[PDB]
Amino acid sequence: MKTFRWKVKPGMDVASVPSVRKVRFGDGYSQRAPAGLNANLKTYSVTLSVPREEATVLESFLEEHGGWKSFLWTPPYEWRQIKVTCAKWSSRVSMLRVEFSAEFEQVVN
Amino acid sequence: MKTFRWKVKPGMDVASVPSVRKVRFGDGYSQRAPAGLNANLKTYSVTLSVPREEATVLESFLEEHGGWKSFLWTPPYEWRQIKVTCAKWSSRVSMLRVEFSAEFEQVVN
C-alpha cells in the first residue's frame, strides 16, 4: 500500500531542527543563510497501541516498506498529507496489546 | 512577521556564559580580559503551551524564520525588547494541547 492507516497515541513528538548555513568565529559577528530550499522536514516520534493480532499487519506494512519506499501519511498535527519514511519501529509486546515506537522522517522525493 | 506574541508559562532558564580570555600564571596568579567587545548575548530556554489549533499558527510563525532570521521578543525577565533567533522548537502533542520547547538566542542582528 501507500498510506499509513493507523491511529497514533496522544503523546507524539515533533522535532524541527531547520538546516541553515551559519558562519561565526569566536564571539564576533554572525551571518545566517537559509541553506537549502526545502527548509526543515521535521521528525515525528510516533507511538501506537494495537491488539496482538493487528501487530502482524502493521509490522508487515512497515517491513514491506523497509526503510526506503516512503509512504503517504496525514499527521494529526497540521492535518496535511505528507510523505515519510520509517527506519526503526521497535515494538513491545504486552499480554494483550502491543506498542509500536517508530520515527517518521518527512521527505520530498 | 516580526514580533513574538505567545506567552511563556513555567519559568524559563536564562543562561549568560560571557566569553572571556583567561591566562593562568604560576603560583596562583592569573590574567583576565573580556575577550569580546560588545556585552553578553544571553539565551532563553523557553516553553509554550497552546491549544491544538494555535499550534499550527505557532509552527508556521517559527518556520517562516527557519532557524536563521531574527524576530522581536520581550522576555518576562528584564522587560526590554530584544531580537532573537530560534532553531529547535521541538513540540509534543497531547489530547487538547501542544507543548513547545525552544531555545531563543539573542542576537545583535
Added chain:
Amino acid sequence: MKTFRWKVKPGMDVASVPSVRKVRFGDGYSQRAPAGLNANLKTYSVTLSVPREEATVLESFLEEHGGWKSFLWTPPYEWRQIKVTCAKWSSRVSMLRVEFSAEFEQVVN
C-alpha cells in the same frame, strides 16, 4: 561596585581540589610536592533566591563584571573576605521569585 551584597541559600557547595605535583609510575613509589605557592583557591557553587524585581539588579551587577573583574565577597563558610569571579550564573524565573545558580572561583590578582 566591588562587593557582592546578597544573601545565599543554605545549600552551597565548596570544592577545594588542591593543585600538587604528583609523580608515580604504575603502582610503584610515589612522590608529592605542593606545586604552586597559592595552594587551593576552592570553588563555591552558590544559589540565591530573590524577588522578580531584584533580578534586574543582580543580573546587571553580574553582567557588568562579566567573567573578568573579580569582586569582593564574604562567604558564610569562613566569614573571611576574599576575591572571586563568576562565569555562568544561570537563572530560573518562577512566577513570583527568581533563583540564581552561579559559581564563585576565588582568585588572587
Added chain:
Amino acid sequence: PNPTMPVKGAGTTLWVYKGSGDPYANPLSDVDWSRLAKVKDLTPGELTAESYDDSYLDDEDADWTATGQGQKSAGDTSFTLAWMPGEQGQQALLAWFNEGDTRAYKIRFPNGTVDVFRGWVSSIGKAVTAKEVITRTVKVTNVGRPSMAEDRSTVTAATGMTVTPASTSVVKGQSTTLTVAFQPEGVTDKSFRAVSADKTKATVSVSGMTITVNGVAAGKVNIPVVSGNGEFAAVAEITVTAS
C-alpha cells in the same frame, strides 16, 4: 412526573442496551433494553475533569494561581442488586464482563427523564452473609461522553406575555388581585417580578403566581411587572379611593 421539582428517587430502574441502533437516539423507549431487576442500591457516575496550568510569566497580577479546564471523565457507576444467577440479565451482565465490550446502559428516574451511559464492566463482586439476601455488586467504568437528562430537556419562549390587572378601585384595609398569564402557547419555563411605582401609596406581594396589591394610601398608583431578564413587561394602574 414533574422534572422541575425535586423527586424522592424511589422507583429508579436500570436497563442495558441489547439492540443495534443508536442507544443515545431514543432512550425514552425501552424496546431494545433489558432490565436488571431487584436493584438494591445504585451510585451513579461522577463527571469529573482535570485541570491545566494557565499561569504565564508575562501575566500581570501573578499573586493568584490560575487554571483551566481540560479533559473530562465520565466516572464509574456502581450498583448492587439481589443475586439471581438463573435470571437472564444477570447472565447478560456476566457475558458483558467476560466479553469486555463497551456497551450502553440507561437509568430511568422517577421523573420521566433518563440518563444513558456507555462503559465496560470493571468489577463483579458478591457479599455472602446469613440473615441477609446475597447481593451482587457491579462496577462499570464509563467511556466517552454520556447523555445527561439535561440534554433531552427543552425550553419554550413563544412570547405569550399577557397581564390581566384588576383595573378597579381599592380602599383602605382591602386588596386586589393581579394576574399574569405564563402561557406562550402554554409551555413556559421562566420567572417574573412585579413592583409598585411609588411604594408610598400601595404595596405588592408576588406569590401564588399572582400579585396582591394593597392600597395603604389613596391616589393613582402604578405597578411595573417585568418577566425574566426583561424580555417582556407590562404596567398596571390602580386607583385607591378615600372611602
Added chain:
Amino acid sequence: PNPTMPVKGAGTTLWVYKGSGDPYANPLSDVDWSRLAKVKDLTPGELTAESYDDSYLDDEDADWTATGQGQKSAGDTSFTLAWMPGEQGQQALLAWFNEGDTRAYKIRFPNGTVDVFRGWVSSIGKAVTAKEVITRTVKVTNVGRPSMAEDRSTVTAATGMTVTPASTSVVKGQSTTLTVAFQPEGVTDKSFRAVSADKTKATVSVSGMTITVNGVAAGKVNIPVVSGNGEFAAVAEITVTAS
C-alpha cells in the same frame, strides 16, 4: 442585615453570571444573574497560600526556620442542590460544565454582603436513594482573584430613585431621551434597567445612564424602569404621532 454582628446563615443564595459586563463591578445587583435554587448544602472554597523558604546562610539565629507567603489560590467551592433537570439554572449548569469556560458566581449571605468568585465546574455528581430527594452535587474550581465581601466596606445603600421622562410626542426617524435621577444625596452603588411595555409602538435602549426611546408606532406607550433586584421602580409614558 448587620455585617458588624454575627449572623445565622439560613438564606444563603447561590447565583451564576449570564451577563457580559464585569461581575466584580456591582455584585449586589441581581440583574444579569441566575439563581441556583434548592441548595441543600454549601461549602465555599478556602483561600490558601503556598510557602517559600526564606532562610539564608548569612543570617544569624539559624536554629529557627523562616518562610514567606507564596502564591494564593481561591480553592474549590462545593455545593449539593436538589436535582431539577427541567428548570433553567441546572441546564445552564450542565452547559457550563460541558463548555468548560470560566464563569462568575456569587454567594449572598443574610448580611447584604456577597462573595463573588470566577471559576469552572470540575465535578458533577448525583446521589440516588429511596426516601431521599435526588441531589445533584457540584464542585467548582476558582481561578484568578476573588472579590471577598471585605473589599466592599462602604455601601451607601442608595434608598432613592426617580425618573423624569420627556412625556412628549415622538416623530418617526427621531428619538427622545429619558432622565433618571438616582442621587439620594449623590453617592450610589446601584444601577437600573428599563424595558418597553409593548415592544411594538416604542423601543427603548439603555446604556450608560442614557435611555433612548424610539417611537416606532403612533399612540401611547409605557416604559417601565426597575432598578437593582426590584426594590425601586417606576413608569414613564411617551406619545407618538404618525406624522
